[PDB]
Design a protein around this ligand. Structure first.
Ligand SMILES: [Mg+2]
Ligand SMILES: [Mg+2]
Ligand SMILES: [Mg+2]
Ligand SMILES: [Mg+2]
Ligand SMILES: [Mg+2]
Ligand SMILES: [Mg+2]
Ligand SMILES: [Mg+2]
Ligand SMILES: [Mg+2]
Ligand SMILES: [Mg+2]
Ligand SMILES: [Mg+2]
Ligand SMILES: [Mg+2]
Ligand SMILES: [Mg+2]
Ligand SMILES: [Mg+2]
Ligand SMILES: [Mg+2]
Ligand SMILES: [Mg+2]
Ligand SMILES: [Mg+2]
Ligand SMILES: [Mg+2]
Ligand SMILES: [Mg+2]
Ligand SMILES: [Mg+2]
Ligand SMILES: [Mg+2]
Ligand SMILES: [Mg+2]
Ligand SMILES: [Mg+2]
Ligand SMILES: [Mg+2]
Ligand SMILES: [Mg+2]
Ligand SMILES: [Mg+2]
Ligand SMILES: [Mg+2]
Ligand SMILES: [Mg+2]
Ligand SMILES: [Mg+2]
Ligand SMILES: [Mg+2]
Ligand SMILES: [Mg+2]
Ligand SMILES: [Mg+2]
Ligand SMILES: [Mg+2]
Ligand SMILES: [Mg+2]
Ligand SMILES: [Mg+2]
Ligand SMILES: [Mg+2]
Ligand SMILES: [Mg+2]
Ligand SMILES: [Mg+2]
Ligand SMILES: [Mg+2]
Ligand SMILES: [Mg+2]
Ligand SMILES: [Mg+2]
Ligand SMILES: [Mg+2]
Ligand SMILES: [Mg+2]
Ligand SMILES: [Mg+2]
Ligand SMILES: [Mg+2]
Ligand SMILES: [Mg+2]
Ligand SMILES: [Mg+2]
Ligand SMILES: [Mg+2]
Ligand SMILES: [Mg+2]
Ligand SMILES: [Zn+2]
Lengths: 104, 159, 75
RNA sequence: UCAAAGUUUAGG
RNA sequence: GUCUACGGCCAUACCACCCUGAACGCGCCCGAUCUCGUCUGAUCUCGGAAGCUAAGCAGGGUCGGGCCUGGUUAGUACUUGGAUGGGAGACCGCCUGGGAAUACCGGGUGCUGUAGGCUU
RNA sequence: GUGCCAGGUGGGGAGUUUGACUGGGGCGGUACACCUGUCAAACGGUAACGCAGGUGUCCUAAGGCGAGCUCAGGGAGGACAGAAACCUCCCGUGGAGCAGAAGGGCAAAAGCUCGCUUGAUCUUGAUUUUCAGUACGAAUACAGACCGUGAAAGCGGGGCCUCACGAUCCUUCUGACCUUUUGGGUUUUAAGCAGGAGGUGUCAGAAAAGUUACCACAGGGAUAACUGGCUUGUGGCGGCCAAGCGUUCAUAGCGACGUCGCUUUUUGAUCCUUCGAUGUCGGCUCUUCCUAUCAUUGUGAAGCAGAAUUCACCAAGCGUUGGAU
RNA sequence: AAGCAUCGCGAAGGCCCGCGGCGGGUGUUGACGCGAUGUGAUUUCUGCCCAGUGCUCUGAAUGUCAAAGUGAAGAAAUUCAAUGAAGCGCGGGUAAACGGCGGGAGUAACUAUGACUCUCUUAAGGUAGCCAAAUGCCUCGUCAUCUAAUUAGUGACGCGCAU
RNA sequence: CGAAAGACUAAUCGAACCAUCUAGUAGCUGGUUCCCUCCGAAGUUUCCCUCAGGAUAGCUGGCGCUCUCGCACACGCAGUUUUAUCCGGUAAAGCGAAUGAUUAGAGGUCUUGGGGCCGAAACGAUCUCAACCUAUUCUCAAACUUUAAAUGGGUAAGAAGCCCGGCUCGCUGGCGUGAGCCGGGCGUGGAAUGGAGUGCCUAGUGGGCCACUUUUGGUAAGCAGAACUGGCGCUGCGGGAUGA
RNA sequence: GGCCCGUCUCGCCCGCCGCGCCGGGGAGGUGGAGCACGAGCGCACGUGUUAGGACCCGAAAGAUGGUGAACUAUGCCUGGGC
RNA sequence: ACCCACCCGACCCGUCUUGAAACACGGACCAAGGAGUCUAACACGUGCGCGAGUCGGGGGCUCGCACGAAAGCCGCCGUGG
RNA sequence: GCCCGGAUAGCUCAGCUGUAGAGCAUCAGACUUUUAAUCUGAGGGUCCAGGGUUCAAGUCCCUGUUCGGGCGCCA
RNA sequence: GUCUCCGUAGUGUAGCGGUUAUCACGUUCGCCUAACACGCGAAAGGUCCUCGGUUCGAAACCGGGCGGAAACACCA
């Protein structure tokens, strides 16, 4: 798929519709001092081998793409997650395809 | 094992009849349902917004809600052992007034006529219906001409 | 060791032991699932029925007096 | 102060 | 009798060719300054009113097609329920009630609502 | 060198695992989550490793409005131009197109071409579909916001409709001058609350390779390997018809193309019986039956001169041997 | 089993035990020895393949690579940085290490085979030998012999299912 | 320990024997103790590393309650039928109607051809076979259909109904709608039958099989798989000699 | 219909030792195992469901600590025999 | 109720099973033994007491306990549930 | 996921912010009787893609797409 | 029967959806040689196995046809 980099959609903070910059979202680095990770650390320590399960059976071959809609009006700048249907091709601002033209 | 899809087996049900395709002619839309109108559901292929499910086609029920361009309609759907009165939101195009009730109202109106009159008279009149009684005693005049004899016809092989 | 896969053989019988009862109709069913904008307005209408009471009571007394005058004229 | 270069009517 | 505008049901209203149309309409028609739009004033938009019913439109016509509706097909095909009926089977007959569809042959060929004309 | 941490190596050793359905199992498939048409017995609902197929995507427009058009095919024309290029007139109920399977739906559209767009946005509940009438997904009607588009009425909170998807725990991002971070206060940190994302396709969601003929235990005739039943496709044997063959002549003997049977000395189907065991091939030895008759008795036939013979009938009394591998 | 052949070790060593010890076995031993594997007297041989999996050799020239240690910013928990052991990679050797060892077409003045040629291909493409063998599906292979008769026996043949 | 057979290790070895943890666990075999009485199933649902088991619906029982009136003075409910009224795309039928299949001749230079024969060649003459077309004609369809049954599924057949009068609305709107409230006025509204409603606890079951008819796979089966009702299972008795 | 808590949306006012990024209320939806003149507590019996040896009997296994080389396996010492 | 006769009827029980007289298993015979227990927790039903309460434990006061390791009482009567 | 590398003309590779290097290959000149062999010249780079820093980027920066050697692995 | 792959000038093979279909041999035509061979220079030659589909476009992607060739066919 293709989506454009600007989007005039709703902005919760402002209450109106407003232009938002768009960008595809990423998982951050994984804290290390989250209760989860702190818990797994002190469980997984010692002997016992591995303690919680390990996923080794991947079925799908694509992620639901998410956009990160950030509000353009300053004094707000409010970011927002916006998911889209799964697709094994994605891009932002990748031409406008053009009806009625010569393919070569 | 069959597919659970919503529209499975409605090849014929939701299909406009022969030479009645195209524009949904306008009376359909512009006739008014109130609360508690008896209404028979009949899905239609042209309009796919607000279609009822194939189980409620044919089924009659009462209107409970009326929105802008649809009508909430309680209908009874049987499920193995239990009849469930349940409420569905059909778009007008899939719905007619069921006449079933009007013949009743006609009769009650006729009764109210025949109750007001025949009160000052004194002669009480049959308000209840009655099933078709045995066909009474009567003469049949074989007027002049006698009966016509019917011999069964002798077999022959045609094909 | 394959089974029987599916059936409906003894089921009608099973259902009809205890009836197949029709769904118990009451008068005064709920207004659950009625178009919200309606329900607000009938709620507000219900709110202010006590406003316009004194007028209504008098109107019925005037009606009752008119009925009593009509029945006296008949008798 | 050394590249590669095989063959040749039966018909006198 | 009939039309126009907006219609309802949507062929008894469709298609083909043929004939006839008073008045009012409806049209074709004549123009592109402006509005509007085209490669093109053909369409679309706009300003008209010299011509004409040729066409559209209406009404009719056709041993017309089509559609609509009856008959026939036929109590036939099928079929609910019945029997320690038949039949080697395949299938069939009866009882008990229900009952179609072509070909073929007739008839029909828009009705009508609201608002406004014309035939004064 | 020893002591203690760190990383590597480590079937030498340990523990454990090694799906399911399945005409026994294994092999192969997936009928394991979905969708179309059929099966399906004219409400709905219905099975098999039934039939014919499709799905794990694709789309910034192929979503949302509004405008204008008309499509497939065919005819007849027109420089180069031919069956096919471009133009023009006619016919054209859709025979085209509408991302994909199929079904439905669709013509001043739901098709094509433009113009403007982000309703594929924010937020409560109700309902439908699977249904237990729980979830998920998918959908329907509203309602409140903020927009789009159109002169407007309206339409639009994704794809004309029917499939395209995923719980708890954990992570990650976004959100509020939000709550807690504990004797109190400020600050980092963490923990909450609310919504998206990271996946479980065995798709209501374990984290998982073999082998055993050295084998074990609980059971199973819910289930294979014999017999025996049912069946007889396949094998075996037998009619009917009669185009041919038989120098000539359908039928002495035969018999195509067709057809109707019997048989259980073939092999399959099937799985009813037996898994707290019915001793699993062959040969030897012995008895008895069957006839679908090789010989022997009595006979009909011939394409029977004799001899040799094949065809048929009564018929199973009596026989049917010795060896090499 | 003798015979053959590999491999490890010069003792703070090879190999191995042990819960632990300035523990123990080989070892009252020292390479004509100790330890680990194969093959299996003699005779005669022992072809090619280091691509794969093993084993092994080298090592700042160097990718990655942990804890500590070093620096960095921060109020600090800290984060980020540079640094960088073996091991992996990178590069040599090794088959008496595990093991492995092809397929099309055309071609000789009767025909047939095919010395010969042409390709496509691998780490090589099965060499000497041997054979329907205790190894060959087809198979009761073909020829010979052995018998009156031989799915047997022997001797030959060899695109040999699969030496 | 083994000159290797997984051999031997006190009749025991692919891990000795003794005691304990131990009454180890078992979705699997087996058994499970007196009488009468009354009611009386299921083998189907969805979910499950589920398919020899659970869960959940269903089917059973028990406990009740709330009302009803044979105490001349009844409402409601149904494995019916009646009268109205919708729904349907199976049987049949159809293919001179679409889709697809398919026979034959008539007719047609439609097209055009490929092969001919008579032609240099010529829509010239004559045939021909290709596809296409004009009327006809033969024969078909689980995944075709213009038609279209029987059996079948909804509703409805009144007091929660009719008919008047007036109030409330922040909804809707030229005025009006539509809804919600008060207050009166009117009674048997098809046949047949039957006392109804309602709530808690709840076991067994979740291997099924058989027949009519319908029906898929298969040459067929005492084969495998659905529908519909009724059986057998749970059930004796008369008949069918014998027998679910 | 109403009230309470959570939550959202929209709104307009009140309060005072500390006027504040203070505190309090209103209208309309919507989540709550709520309120709306109480029904519990204790004791006893019954049925059901579980955890326990858990209706009774049944494994193959697993773990801890001990006993055996009088058979047999192999080494060594000392004797015998052909 | 003991024995005998005769007519009619009449396969062996238990069990798993769609189906058992089965060529399905267990069972020569008799005696005694022999399997739904107890504790805890929950839920519903029922009986009793008290009732916006109720409660009894645990502790204590009354006896050498014959009967008692009971029975009685407690601003503990309610810490507390 | 983390580290690191390559991507440049047909191919293999140099490149220190200011006509893109080398060699081969490609095509025209010599040599050849000619061909090959070899010597001369000529042509040929979107410097993988996009954005920035910069007066100026093939390089610096970030971000992707690859590549391919190690690390790593909780729904 | 299953699953798999492969069908390209005369021969053997390359081929990343847009090619004049690549290379070698073979073929013909020159030259060189006395002639042949080698050698040098030129040329010609594909039904891309068959049909249908998707595609603006298929030698390839997808379906079925007709061929061809490996592996499986086990416990009794
Ligand atoms: Mg550690
Ligand atoms: Mg079952
Ligand atoms: Mg004009
Ligand atoms: Mg005219
Ligand atoms: Mg005229
Ligand atoms: Mg006519
Ligand atoms: Mg192991
Ligand atoms: Mg299985
Ligand atoms: Mg039906
Ligand atoms: Mg339009
Ligand atoms: Mg669309
Ligand atoms: Mg809205
Ligand atoms: Mg402190
Ligand atoms: Mg073995
Ligand atoms: Mg074996
Ligand atoms: Mg062994
Ligand atoms: Mg069996
Ligand atoms: Mg003859
Ligand atoms: Mg058998
Ligand atoms: Mg025996
Ligand atoms: Mg005989
Ligand atoms: Mg060796
Ligand atoms: Mg190597
Ligand atoms: Mg091997
Ligand atoms: Mg050899
Ligand atoms: Mg012999
Ligand atoms: Mg031999
Ligand atoms: Mg063991
Ligand atoms: Mg026990
Ligand atoms: Mg089980
Ligand atoms: Mg009872
Ligand atoms: Mg149907
Ligand atoms: Mg039919
Ligand atoms: Mg069971
Ligand atoms: Mg069965
Ligand atoms: Mg049973
Ligand atoms: Mg319970
Ligand atoms: Mg118990
Ligand atoms: Mg035990
Ligand atoms: Mg264990
Ligand atoms: Mg059992
Ligand atoms: Mg059985
Ligand atoms: Mg029995
Ligand atoms: Mg028997
Ligand atoms: Mg048993
Ligand atoms: Mg016994
Ligand atoms: Mg006893
Ligand atoms: Mg109680
Ligand atoms: Zn904002």
């Amino acid at each position: 798929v293709n989506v454009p980099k600007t989007r005039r959609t709703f902005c919760k903070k402002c209450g109106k519709h407003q232009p938002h910059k768009v960008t595809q979202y990423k998982k951050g680095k994984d804290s290390l001092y989250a209760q989860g990770k702190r818990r797994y650390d002190r469980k997984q320590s010692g002997y016992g081998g591995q303690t919680k399960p390990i996923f080794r059976k991947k079925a799908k071959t694509t992620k639901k793409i998410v956009l990160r809609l950030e509000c353009v009006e300053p004094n707000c700048r409010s970011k927002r997650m916006l998911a889209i249907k799964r697709c094994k091709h994605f891009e932002l601002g990748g031409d406008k395809k053009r009806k009625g033209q010569v393919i070569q | 094992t069959n597919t659970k899809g919503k529209r499975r087996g409605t090849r014929y049900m939701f299909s406009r009849p022969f030479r009645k395709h195209g524009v949904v002619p306008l009376a359909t839309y512009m006739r008014i349902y109130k609360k508690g109108d008896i209404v028979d559901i009949k899905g239609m292929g042209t309009v796919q917004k607000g279609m009822p499910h194939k189980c409620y086609h044919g089924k009659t029920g009462r209107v409970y809600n009326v929105t802008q361009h649809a009508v909430g309609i309680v209908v009874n759907k049987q499920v193995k052992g239990k009849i469930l009165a349940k409420r569905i939101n059909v778009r007008i195009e899939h719905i007619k007034h069921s006449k079933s009730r009007d013949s009743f109202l006609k009769r009650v109106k006729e009764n109210d006529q025949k109750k007001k009159e025949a009160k000052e008279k004194g002669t009480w009149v049959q308000l209840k219906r009655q099933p078709a009684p045995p066909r009474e005693a009567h003469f049949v005049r074989t007027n002049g001409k006698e009966p016509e004899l019917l011999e069964p016809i002798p077999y022959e092989f045609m094909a | 060791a394959k089974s029987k896969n599916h059936t409906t053989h003894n089921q009608s019988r099973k259902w009809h032991r205890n009836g197949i009862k029709k769904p118990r109709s009451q008068r005064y069913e709920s207004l659950k699932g009625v178009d919200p904008k309606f329900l607000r307005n009938m709620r507000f209408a219900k709110k202010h029925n006590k406003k316009g009471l004194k007028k209504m009571q008098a109107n019925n007394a005037k009606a009752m007096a008119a009925r009593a005058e009509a029945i006296k004229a008949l008798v």
